Amino acid sequence: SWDKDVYPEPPRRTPAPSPQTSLPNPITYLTKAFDLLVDRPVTLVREFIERQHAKNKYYYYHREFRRVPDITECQEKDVLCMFEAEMQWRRDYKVDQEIVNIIQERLKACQQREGESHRQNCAKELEQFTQVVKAYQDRYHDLGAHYSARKCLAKQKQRMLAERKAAKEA
Amino acid sequence: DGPEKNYERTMAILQIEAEKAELRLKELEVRRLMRARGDGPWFHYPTIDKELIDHSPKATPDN
DSSP states (O other), X not given: OOOTTTSOOOOOOOOOOXXXXXXXXXXXXXXXXXXXXXXXXXXXXXXXXXXXXXXXXOOOOOOOOOOXXXXXXXXXXXXXXXXXXXXXXXXXXXXXXXXXXXXXXXXXXXXXXXXXXXXXXXXXXXXXHHHHHHHHHHHHTTXXXXXXXXXXXXXXXXXXXXXXXXXXXX | XXXXXXXXXXXXXXXXXXXXXXXXXXXXXXXXHHHHHOOSSTTOOOOOOGGGOOOSOOSSSOO
């Protein structure tokens, strides 16, 4: 239903039953009851609905935005170019918010999945989360409620000047 | 309305408003120059019309 590369999960390892008791397992009989009384009627309703769905197959599409010149290429006060660049920057900003949300979802799923071993086994997710948050912070943090591609550029150039100075003093 | 129509309608709005904004700034500068120098159609205050002068020979010569 979804891309396994975007939202990965490791292969699942379930141990086999290994009873060391002669008493019956109540969960095993409740499981069989659940299958007969809940799952099968639920599955029958769903298969009828999907049969109706197959008679009327129609599609929707993911919208594709051509790339347009950035705010760096816009002449000062040229609103026609600034407008398209500003709109593009706003779309990218929303996309980067959802990229962070994907990485946070990976991290939280790993924490629950790994149980009492999360601190060691979720290191790779923790590292990826650390990096994307740092990149996201560099791009967009401290812009304010009236953010813009102009203010975003002003921040990058301030960061670039601080990095150029530090490299020079070395 | 679809996103394209709103988007390109916005650009049409921005073009009109940017052209008006530039003209408003140019009028202020033209008015400043015309008022200071007097070489334009605005702030042209009247002077006496030279067609009211009589150029006929007069009763006495020196004039």
